Amino acid sequence: DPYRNVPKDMKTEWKWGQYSSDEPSKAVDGDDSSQFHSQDSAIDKPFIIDMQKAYTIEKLELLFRKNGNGSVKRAEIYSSLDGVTYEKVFSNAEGSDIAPWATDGEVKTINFNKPIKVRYFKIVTKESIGNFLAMREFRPYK
Ligand SMILES: [Ca+2]
Ligand SMILES: [Mg+2]
C-alpha cells in the first residue's frame, strides 16, 4: 500500500482548542476527509506531531482544507529528536525561496534532500485563510 512507510499511531499536541468535532487527532487518522480545525488563530502556534519513536524520515505530505478557513498558504516545519530542541526543516514563509501553497486541497509534498532522524514534528502556520489551521492529514514517510 502507498502508506506502508507512514508511522502508525502518531499522537498530536495542540493547546488552543478545536472547532466543532475537528479534533487534533483527525490530522493523523489516515482519513483524507477528516481534519483538525483550530478553534481560533493558529498563526505562530505550534501543532506538534509525536511519532512515538525516532525514524529517518525522507519526505512529508500535508493535506489542508480546500478553499476555506484553515487552508494553509505558508508554514514553517521543525523537527526534533528530544522534544525540546527543534531545527527548521522547511519554510515557505515570506522571504524564503519557496512559493506559498495554493489553497486547492491537493497534497503538498516536501521531499527532503537527505533523510532526517526525527521523532517530533512541529508545524507553525504563517499564513492561512482566516488565520486558522485546518489540516486533513500529515504523513511523514520512513
Ligand atoms: Ca484526517
Ligand atoms: Mg527512514
PDB file of N, CA and C in Angstrom, residues 47-126:
ATOM      1  N   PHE A  47       1.714  23.224  16.158  1.00  0.00           N
ATOM      2  CA  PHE A  47       0.955  21.981  16.144  1.00  0.00           C
ATOM      3  C   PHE A  47       1.995  20.870  16.120  1.00  0.00           C
ATOM      4  N   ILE A  48       2.011  20.039  17.155  1.00  0.00           N
ATOM      5  CA  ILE A  48       3.078  19.061  17.319  1.00  0.00           C
ATOM      6  C   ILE A  48       2.585  17.654  17.038  1.00  0.00           C
ATOM      7  N   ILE A  49       3.367  16.919  16.254  1.00  0.00           N
ATOM      8  CA  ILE A  49       3.087  15.524  15.986  1.00  0.00           C
ATOM      9  C   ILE A  49       4.230  14.695  16.551  1.00  0.00           C
ATOM     10  N   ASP A  50       3.896  13.752  17.425  1.00  0.00           N
ATOM     11  CA  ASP A  50       4.864  12.848  18.028  1.00  0.00           C
ATOM     12  C   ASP A  50       4.715  11.486  17.378  1.00  0.00           C
ATOM     13  N   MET A  51       5.754  11.044  16.677  1.00  0.00           N
ATOM     14  CA  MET A  51       5.705   9.744  16.029  1.00  0.00           C
ATOM     15  C   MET A  51       5.945   8.575  16.982  1.00  0.00           C
ATOM     16  N   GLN A  52       6.178   8.877  18.264  1.00  0.00           N
ATOM     17  CA  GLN A  52       6.369   7.885  19.350  1.00  0.00           C
ATOM     18  C   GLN A  52       7.778   7.316  19.408  1.00  0.00           C
ATOM     19  N   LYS A  53       8.501   7.430  18.302  1.00  0.00           N
ATOM     20  CA  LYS A  53       9.794   6.804  18.134  1.00  0.00           C
ATOM     21  C   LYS A  53      10.526   7.629  17.090  1.00  0.00           C
ATOM     22  N   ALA A  54      11.855   7.595  17.107  1.00  0.00           N
ATOM     23  CA  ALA A  54      12.640   8.271  16.082  1.00  0.00           C
ATOM     24  C   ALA A  54      12.727   7.414  14.830  1.00  0.00           C
ATOM     25  N   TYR A  55      12.563   8.054  13.678  1.00  0.00           N
ATOM     26  CA  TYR A  55      12.712   7.394  12.380  1.00  0.00           C
ATOM     27  C   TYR A  55      13.512   8.286  11.454  1.00  0.00           C
ATOM     28  N   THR A  56      14.129   7.695  10.437  1.00  0.00           N
ATOM     29  CA  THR A  56      14.725   8.500   9.377  1.00  0.00           C
ATOM     30  C   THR A  56      13.638   8.817   8.347  1.00  0.00           C
ATOM     31  N   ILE A  57      13.185  10.061   8.371  1.00  0.00           N
ATOM     32  CA  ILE A  57      12.092  10.491   7.515  1.00  0.00           C
ATOM     33  C   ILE A  57      12.635  11.076   6.219  1.00  0.00           C
ATOM     34  N   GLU A  58      12.043  10.648   5.113  1.00  0.00           N
ATOM     35  CA  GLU A  58      12.507  11.043   3.785  1.00  0.00           C
ATOM     36  C   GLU A  58      11.683  12.144   3.129  1.00  0.00           C
ATOM     37  N   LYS A  59      10.413  12.244   3.509  1.00  0.00           N
ATOM     38  CA  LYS A  59       9.522  13.231   2.921  1.00  0.00           C
ATOM     39  C   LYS A  59       8.294  13.394   3.788  1.00  0.00           C
ATOM     40  N   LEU A  60       7.600  14.506   3.567  1.00  0.00           N
ATOM     41  CA  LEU A  60       6.328  14.777   4.221  1.00  0.00           C
ATOM     42  C   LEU A  60       5.261  15.037   3.179  1.00  0.00           C
ATOM     43  N   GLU A  61       4.045  14.579   3.457  1.00  0.00           N
ATOM     44  CA  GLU A  61       2.875  15.008   2.702  1.00  0.00           C
ATOM     45  C   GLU A  61       1.915  15.687   3.657  1.00  0.00           C
ATOM     46  N   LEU A  62       1.440  16.863   3.261  1.00  0.00           N
ATOM     47  CA  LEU A  62       0.458  17.630   4.025  1.00  0.00           C
ATOM     48  C   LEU A  62      -0.787  17.864   3.188  1.00  0.00           C
ATOM     49  N   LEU A  63      -1.938  17.730   3.829  1.00  0.00           N
ATOM     50  CA  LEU A  63      -3.209  17.891   3.147  1.00  0.00           C
ATOM     51  C   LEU A  63      -4.041  18.845   3.978  1.00  0.00           C
ATOM     52  N   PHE A  64      -4.400  19.977   3.377  1.00  0.00           N
ATOM     53  CA  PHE A  64      -5.164  21.013   4.061  1.00  0.00           C
ATOM     54  C   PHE A  64      -6.563  21.138   3.482  1.00  0.00           C
ATOM     55  N   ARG A  65      -7.437  21.799   4.230  1.00  0.00           N
ATOM     56  CA  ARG A  65      -8.761  22.136   3.735  1.00  0.00           C
ATOM     57  C   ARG A  65      -8.676  22.843   2.391  1.00  0.00           C
ATOM     58  N   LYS A  66      -9.654  22.564   1.534  1.00  0.00           N
ATOM     59  CA  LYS A  66      -9.774  23.221   0.242  1.00  0.00           C
ATOM     60  C   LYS A  66     -10.546  24.528   0.367  1.00  0.00           C
ATOM     61  N   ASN A  67      -9.929  25.614  -0.081  1.00  0.00           N
ATOM     62  CA  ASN A  67     -10.592  26.912  -0.221  1.00  0.00           C
ATOM     63  C   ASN A  67     -11.560  27.356   0.884  1.00  0.00           C
ATOM     64  N   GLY A  68     -11.082  27.406   2.121  1.00  0.00           N
ATOM     65  CA  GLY A  68     -11.890  27.882   3.232  1.00  0.00           C
ATOM     66  C   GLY A  68     -11.045  28.113   4.464  1.00  0.00           C
ATOM     67  N   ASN A  69     -11.694  28.487   5.561  1.00  0.00           N
ATOM     68  CA  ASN A  69     -10.987  28.730   6.811  1.00  0.00           C
ATOM     69  C   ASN A  69     -10.024  27.606   7.149  1.00  0.00           C
ATOM     70  N   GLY A  70      -8.758  27.963   7.316  1.00  0.00           N
ATOM     71  CA  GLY A  70      -7.763  26.976   7.686  1.00  0.00           C
ATOM     72  C   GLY A  70      -6.913  26.437   6.550  1.00  0.00           C
ATOM     73  N   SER A  71      -7.244  26.793   5.310  1.00  0.00           N
ATOM     74  CA  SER A  71      -6.400  26.435   4.171  1.00  0.00           C
ATOM     75  C   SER A  71      -5.069  27.146   4.329  1.00  0.00           C
ATOM     76  N   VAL A  72      -3.985  26.384   4.400  1.00  0.00           N
ATOM     77  CA  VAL A  72      -2.677  26.966   4.691  1.00  0.00           C
ATOM     78  C   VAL A  72      -1.918  27.350   3.430  1.00  0.00           C
ATOM     79  N   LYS A  73      -1.418  28.582   3.396  1.00  0.00           N
ATOM     80  CA  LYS A  73      -0.609  29.069   2.282  1.00  0.00           C
ATOM     81  C   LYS A  73       0.881  29.013   2.623  1.00  0.00           C
ATOM     82  N   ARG A  74       1.219  29.332   3.870  1.00  0.00           N
ATOM     83  CA  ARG A  74       2.616  29.369   4.293  1.00  0.00           C
ATOM     84  C   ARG A  74       2.764  28.787   5.684  1.00  0.00           C
ATOM     85  N   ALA A  75       3.820  28.005   5.875  1.00  0.00           N
ATOM     86  CA  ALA A  75       4.118  27.425   7.175  1.00  0.00           C
ATOM     87  C   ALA A  75       5.605  27.180   7.318  1.00  0.00           C
ATOM     88  N   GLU A  76       6.042  27.048   8.563  1.00  0.00           N
ATOM     89  CA  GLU A  76       7.375  26.547   8.850  1.00  0.00           C
ATOM     90  C   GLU A  76       7.214  25.205   9.523  1.00  0.00           C
ATOM     91  N   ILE A  77       8.106  24.272   9.207  1.00  0.00           N
ATOM     92  CA  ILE A  77       8.098  22.963   9.843  1.00  0.00           C
ATOM     93  C   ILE A  77       9.445  22.710  10.491  1.00  0.00           C
ATOM     94  N   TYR A  78       9.405  22.212  11.723  1.00  0.00           N
ATOM     95  CA  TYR A  78      10.593  21.931  12.516  1.00  0.00           C
ATOM     96  C   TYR A  78      10.584  20.478  12.924  1.00  0.00           C
ATOM     97  N   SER A  79      11.775  19.943  13.180  1.00  0.00           N
ATOM     98  CA  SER A  79      11.923  18.569  13.651  1.00  0.00           C
ATOM     99  C   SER A  79      12.686  18.530  14.968  1.00  0.00           C
ATOM    100  N   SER A  80      12.463  17.477  15.749  1.00  0.00           N
ATOM    101  CA  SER A  80      13.217  17.284  16.982  1.00  0.00           C
ATOM    102  C   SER A  80      13.342  15.808  17.294  1.00  0.00           C
ATOM    103  N   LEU A  81      14.458  15.435  17.916  1.00  0.00           N
ATOM    104  CA  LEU A  81      14.607  14.104  18.497  1.00  0.00           C
ATOM    105  C   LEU A  81      14.162  14.038  19.955  1.00  0.00           C
ATOM    106  N   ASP A  82      14.387  15.114  20.701  1.00  0.00           N
ATOM    107  CA  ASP A  82      14.112  15.085  22.142  1.00  0.00           C
ATOM    108  C   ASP A  82      12.852  15.827  22.595  1.00  0.00           C
ATOM    109  N   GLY A  83      12.245  16.587  21.695  1.00  0.00           N
ATOM    110  CA  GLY A  83      11.052  17.342  22.023  1.00  0.00           C
ATOM    111  C   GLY A  83      11.321  18.664  22.724  1.00  0.00           C
ATOM    112  N   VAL A  84      12.586  19.059  22.819  1.00  0.00           N
ATOM    113  CA  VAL A  84      12.936  20.360  23.394  1.00  0.00           C
ATOM    114  C   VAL A  84      13.585  21.250  22.345  1.00  0.00           C
ATOM    115  N   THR A  85      14.648  20.734  21.734  1.00  0.00           N
ATOM    116  CA  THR A  85      15.387  21.463  20.711  1.00  0.00           C
ATOM    117  C   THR A  85      14.838  21.111  19.333  1.00  0.00           C
ATOM    118  N   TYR A  86      14.333  22.123  18.637  1.00  0.00           N
ATOM    119  CA  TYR A  86      13.779  21.937  17.296  1.00  0.00           C
ATOM    120  C   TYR A  86      14.656  22.615  16.256  1.00  0.00           C
ATOM    121  N   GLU A  87      14.798  21.984  15.092  1.00  0.00           N
ATOM    122  CA  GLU A  87      15.525  22.585  13.976  1.00  0.00           C
ATOM    123  C   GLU A  87      14.565  22.770  12.805  1.00  0.00           C
ATOM    124  N   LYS A  88      14.675  23.894  12.105  1.00  0.00           N
ATOM    125  CA  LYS A  88      13.771  24.159  10.987  1.00  0.00           C
ATOM    126  C   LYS A  88      14.154  23.301   9.786  1.00  0.00           C
ATOM    127  N   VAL A  89      13.190  22.566   9.243  1.00  0.00           N
ATOM    128  CA  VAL A  89      13.465  21.727   8.084  1.00  0.00           C
ATOM    129  C   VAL A  89      12.712  22.179   6.836  1.00  0.00           C
ATOM    130  N   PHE A  90      11.752  23.086   6.978  1.00  0.00           N
ATOM    131  CA  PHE A  90      11.053  23.615   5.817  1.00  0.00           C
ATOM    132  C   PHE A  90      10.476  24.968   6.135  1.00  0.00           C
ATOM    133  N   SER A  91      10.493  25.867   5.159  1.00  0.00           N
ATOM    134  CA  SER A  91       9.745  27.108   5.277  1.00  0.00           C
ATOM    135  C   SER A  91       9.360  27.652   3.915  1.00  0.00           C
ATOM    136  N   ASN A  92       8.084  27.998   3.761  1.00  0.00           N
ATOM    137  CA  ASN A  92       7.674  28.858   2.655  1.00  0.00           C
ATOM    138  C   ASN A  92       7.043  30.147   3.187  1.00  0.00           C
ATOM    139  N   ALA A  93       7.538  30.590   4.342  1.00  0.00           N
ATOM    140  CA  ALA A  93       7.171  31.887   4.888  1.00  0.00           C
ATOM    141  C   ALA A  93       7.694  32.983   3.970  1.00  0.00           C
ATOM    142  N   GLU A  94       7.189  34.199   4.145  1.00  0.00           N
ATOM    143  CA  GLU A  94       7.673  35.331   3.360  1.00  0.00           C
ATOM    144  C   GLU A  94       9.178  35.484   3.540  1.00  0.00           C
ATOM    145  N   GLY A  95       9.898  35.630   2.433  1.00  0.00           N
ATOM    146  CA  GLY A  95      11.340  35.776   2.491  1.00  0.00           C
ATOM    147  C   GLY A  95      12.082  34.517   2.089  1.00  0.00           C
ATOM    148  N   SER A  96      11.398  33.380   2.147  1.00  0.00           N
ATOM    149  CA  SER A  96      12.011  32.125   1.738  1.00  0.00           C
ATOM    150  C   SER A  96      11.997  32.044   0.218  1.00  0.00           C
ATOM    151  N   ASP A  97      12.714  31.070  -0.330  1.00  0.00           N
ATOM    152  CA  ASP A  97      12.796  30.910  -1.778  1.00  0.00           C
ATOM    153  C   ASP A  97      11.745  29.934  -2.286  1.00  0.00           C
ATOM    154  N   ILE A  98      10.831  29.545  -1.405  1.00  0.00           N
ATOM    155  CA  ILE A  98       9.805  28.575  -1.749  1.00  0.00           C
ATOM    156  C   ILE A  98       8.443  29.252  -1.818  1.00  0.00           C
ATOM    157  N   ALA A  99       7.729  29.003  -2.909  1.00  0.00           N
ATOM    158  CA  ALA A  99       6.437  29.632  -3.150  1.00  0.00           C
ATOM    159  C   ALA A  99       5.400  29.236  -2.106  1.00  0.00           C
ATOM    160  N   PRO A 100       4.425  30.119  -1.851  1.00  0.00           N
ATOM    161  CA  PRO A 100       3.297  29.735  -0.996  1.00  0.00           C
ATOM    162  C   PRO A 100       2.466  28.658  -1.678  1.00  0.00           C
ATOM    163  N   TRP A 101       1.729  27.890  -0.886  1.00  0.00           N
ATOM    164  CA  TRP A 101       0.888  26.824  -1.409  1.00  0.00           C
ATOM    165  C   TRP A 101      -0.438  27.375  -1.899  1.00  0.00           C
ATOM    166  N   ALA A 102      -0.939  26.815  -2.999  1.00  0.00           N
ATOM    167  CA  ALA A 102      -2.307  27.096  -3.417  1.00  0.00           C
ATOM    168  C   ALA A 102      -3.263  26.477  -2.411  1.00  0.00           C
ATOM    169  N   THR A 103      -4.423  27.095  -2.235  1.00  0.00           N
ATOM    170  CA  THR A 103      -5.420  26.602  -1.296  1.00  0.00           C
ATOM    171  C   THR A 103      -6.379  25.625  -1.977  1.00  0.00           C
ATOM    172  N   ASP A 104      -5.811  24.725  -2.772  1.00  0.00           N
ATOM    173  CA  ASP A 104      -6.599  23.862  -3.647  1.00  0.00           C
ATOM    174  C   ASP A 104      -6.956  22.487  -3.071  1.00  0.00           C
ATOM    175  N   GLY A 105      -6.568  22.212  -1.830  1.00  0.00           N
ATOM    176  CA  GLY A 105      -6.890  20.942  -1.211  1.00  0.00           C
ATOM    177  C   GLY A 105      -6.093  19.748  -1.717  1.00  0.00           C
ATOM    178  N   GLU A 106      -5.071  19.985  -2.543  1.00  0.00           N
ATOM    179  CA  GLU A 106      -4.255  18.893  -3.076  1.00  0.00           C
ATOM    180  C   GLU A 106      -3.063  18.630  -2.149  1.00  0.00           C
ATOM    181  N   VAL A 107      -2.468  17.454  -2.264  1.00  0.00           N
ATOM    182  CA  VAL A 107      -1.352  17.088  -1.395  1.00  0.00           C
ATOM    183  C   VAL A 107      -0.174  18.014  -1.636  1.00  0.00           C
ATOM    184  N   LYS A 108       0.412  18.518  -0.552  1.00  0.00           N
ATOM    185  CA  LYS A 108       1.637  19.302  -0.634  1.00  0.00           C
ATOM    186  C   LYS A 108       2.771  18.394  -0.176  1.00  0.00           C
ATOM    187  N   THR A 109       3.784  18.234  -1.020  1.00  0.00           N
ATOM    188  CA  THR A 109       4.884  17.324  -0.718  1.00  0.00           C
ATOM    189  C   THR A 109       6.163  18.087  -0.424  1.00  0.00           C
ATOM    190  N   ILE A 110       6.849  17.674   0.631  1.00  0.00           N
ATOM    191  CA  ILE A 110       8.167  18.192   0.937  1.00  0.00           C
ATOM    192  C   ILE A 110       9.120  17.020   0.897  1.00  0.00           C
ATOM    193  N   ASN A 111       9.958  16.969  -0.132  1.00  0.00           N
ATOM    194  CA  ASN A 111      10.949  15.911  -0.268  1.00  0.00           C
ATOM    195  C   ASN A 111      12.260  16.368   0.312  1.00  0.00           C
ATOM    196  N   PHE A 112      12.712  15.692   1.356  1.00  0.00           N
ATOM    197  CA  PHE A 112      13.955  16.083   1.987  1.00  0.00           C
ATOM    198  C   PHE A 112      15.146  15.737   1.093  1.00  0.00           C
ATOM    199  N   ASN A 113      16.128  16.622   1.076  1.00  0.00           N
ATOM    200  CA  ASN A 113      17.329  16.382   0.287  1.00  0.00           C
ATOM    201  C   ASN A 113      18.147  15.220   0.832  1.00  0.00           C
ATOM    202  N   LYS A 114      18.021  14.954   2.123  1.00  0.00           N
ATOM    203  CA  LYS A 114      18.508  13.698   2.675  1.00  0.00           C
ATOM    204  C   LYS A 114      17.650  13.361   3.879  1.00  0.00           C
ATOM    205  N   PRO A 115      17.530  12.061   4.195  1.00  0.00           N
ATOM    206  CA  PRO A 115      16.656  11.695   5.315  1.00  0.00           C
ATOM    207  C   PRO A 115      17.108  12.338   6.625  1.00  0.00           C
ATOM    208  N   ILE A 116      16.137  12.648   7.466  1.00  0.00           N
ATOM    209  CA  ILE A 116      16.410  13.282   8.732  1.00  0.00           C
ATOM    210  C   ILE A 116      15.895  12.384   9.849  1.00  0.00           C
ATOM    211  N   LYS A 117      16.719  12.163  10.867  1.00  0.00           N
ATOM    212  CA  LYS A 117      16.297  11.392  12.033  1.00  0.00           C
ATOM    213  C   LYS A 117      15.454  12.323  12.901  1.00  0.00           C
ATOM    214  N   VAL A 118      14.210  11.921  13.153  1.00  0.00           N
ATOM    215  CA  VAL A 118      13.221  12.790  13.795  1.00  0.00           C
ATOM    216  C   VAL A 118      12.288  11.931  14.624  1.00  0.00           C
ATOM    217  N   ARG A 119      11.862  12.446  15.782  1.00  0.00           N
ATOM    218  CA  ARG A 119      10.688  11.897  16.472  1.00  0.00           C
ATOM    219  C   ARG A 119       9.465  12.826  16.438  1.00  0.00           C
ATOM    220  N   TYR A 120       9.699  14.125  16.613  1.00  0.00           N
ATOM    221  CA  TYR A 120       8.637  15.129  16.699  1.00  0.00           C
ATOM    222  C   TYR A 120       8.706  16.069  15.519  1.00  0.00           C
ATOM    223  N   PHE A 121       7.543  16.399  14.964  1.00  0.00           N
ATOM    224  CA  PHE A 121       7.438  17.494  14.007  1.00  0.00           C
ATOM    225  C   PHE A 121       6.592  18.591  14.624  1.00  0.00           C
ATOM    226  N   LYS A 122       6.963  19.832  14.344  1.00  0.00           N
ATOM    227  CA  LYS A 122       6.212  20.997  14.775  1.00  0.00           C
ATOM    228  C   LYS A 122       5.844  21.790  13.538  1.00  0.00           C
ATOM    229  N   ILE A 123       4.548  22.017  13.347  1.00  0.00           N
ATOM    230  CA  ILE A 123       4.071  22.814  12.227  1.00  0.00           C
ATOM    231  C   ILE A 123       3.607  24.160  12.755  1.00  0.00           C
ATOM    232  N   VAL A 124       4.191  25.228  12.228  1.00  0.00           N
ATOM    233  CA  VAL A 124       3.836  26.579  12.633  1.00  0.00           C
ATOM    234  C   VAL A 124       3.229  27.295  11.425  1.00  0.00           C
ATOM    235  N   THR A 125       1.927  27.524  11.485  1.00  0.00           N
ATOM    236  CA  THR A 125       1.215  28.207  10.419  1.00  0.00           C
ATOM    237  C   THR A 125       1.658  29.665  10.372  1.00  0.00           C
ATOM    238  N   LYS A 126       1.974  30.147   9.178  1.00  0.00           N
ATOM    239  CA  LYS A 126       2.396  31.535   8.992  1.00  0.00           C
ATOM    240  C   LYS A 126       1.394  32.368   8.204  1.00  0.00           C
TER     241      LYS A 126
END
